[PDB]
Structure 1
């Protein structure tokens, strides 16, 4: 690997991936004896223990191309189970800020990265691992956290204008919008990794936040070590 410079044995098989390096550092506090194993290119990676298991928390930056690079290199270092923990904008009225969304699939526009990996324009089912996702639901339910289960649209252009945005994507079965779930799910299916995702609603297109991010992180870490 040329972006994540951690040595083999420094990355755990179980990894919690976040887009914001700042969140990676903040969540490392939930691990026992956390150690920084990479800082190159801003991709902070911490490794420690939790619930009798070794786990790593890694930064993936923003966008499909960026997360694909991080997942590929972490895998080269031993990782094989990834749970995405990010933020999202809800596309439906009833979901409130600070609540969570457990992702069941990802809609996306074809092209670029997908074409290079799949070699044609087939719409391959972009879904998380069945069992891992159910473990997430169980964990969030045990911690009495309010969540919704559903598909999300993985956008590549956060600023491209679309006057029909909310109605378009929500009418297509998506309850939220984010940017890297489709890449995570599809690449994992091709590579044989087990992946899932949970998002914190930080906006609704249709301190309390710190509490939300922290609460959800504990639930994800429980899932990763169960």
Structure 2
């Protein structure tokens, strides 16, 4: 039985939208029909409701690979199998402006720790999202005429260890943004058989945001994410 997410079985939907910040989970729940808080233990708020004719949940995953791994595992134990992460990111290329969106196609990461414990060796396993789901997401964002970019991101483990060199290094490796939990999400999903994808809102540009404008972009895009999730 899950020791972090204390929701009753059946209280978590098969389709889940995961966000790092609890407050955003609460804000996004207002987009659902008849939202109910199904868990608040350890600050990991989970809301379940309806969108279209489908049941869906919005869960908090906290910060970092170890945190999201725990939440995903327990949500799966509760019946979840489809996850779409909706978070913030720091752009690594100058042509992407704050507030715009990034649909992730892959995640780069430094090996070790979590990956070693799960994979049992240092192999560079392809950390990619579900192909179908990611395309559906692209379509959804395209229909709502939202400004987005398709590309790989680097999943950092040390937020406060990202100097200037850091930018040229990862941008030169085909990464257009940095975040912290996509690598874990994709790799764990591939191993567990879960279908996952991710959309990010550019909160800052490292090659060059207000809490209000963030929410404005968040809301405008969450609509595309929910349509996708329930498509």
Under a length normalisation based on structure 2, what TM-score does the superposition of the two structures give? Answer: 0.97
CA deviation after TM superposition for structure 1 residue 160, in Å: 1.4
Unaligned runs of 5+ in 1: none
Distance 1:118 1:37, change over 3 A: same
1:44-76 Cα offsets, whole Å, 9 max, x none, are: 000000010000000000000000000000000
Displaced runs of 4 or more, over 4 A:
none
Deviation at 1:37, TM superposition (A): 0.1
SS of the residue corresponding to residue 126 of structure 1 reads: coil
Q: 1:111 and 1:32, CA in 2 relative to 1: closer, same or farther beyond 3 A?
A: same
Deviations 1:10-38 (A, max 9, x none): 00000000000000000000000000000
CA distance in 1, matches of 2:85, 2:213: 21
Unaligned runs of 5+ in 2: none
Instruction: Give the match for residue 180 of structure 1.
Output: 181
Distance 1:194 1:212 in 2: 25
Following superposition, the deviation at residue 211 of structure 1 comes to 1.4
- Aligned partner of residue 125 in structure 2, secondary structure: coil
TM-score (norm 1): 0.99
Q: Tell me, in whole angstroms, the C-alpha distance in 2 between the residues paired with 1:5 and 1:73.
A: 9
* Aligned mates of 2:215, 2:36 — CA distance in 1: 23
Shift of 1:5: 0.2
Residue pairs, 1:208-219, within 5 angstroms: 208-219=213-224
Greater Cα offset, 203-212 or 10-19: 203-212
RMSD, aligned α-carbons: 0.6
CA deviations over 1:147-176 (Å, ceiling 9, x no partner) = 000000000000015341110000000000
Between the aligned partners of 1:72 and 1:161, the Cα distance in structure 2 is: 29
> SS at the partner of 2:93?
coil
Q: CA deviation at 1:208?
A: 2.7
Count of matched residue positions in the alignment of Structure 1 and Structure 2: 226
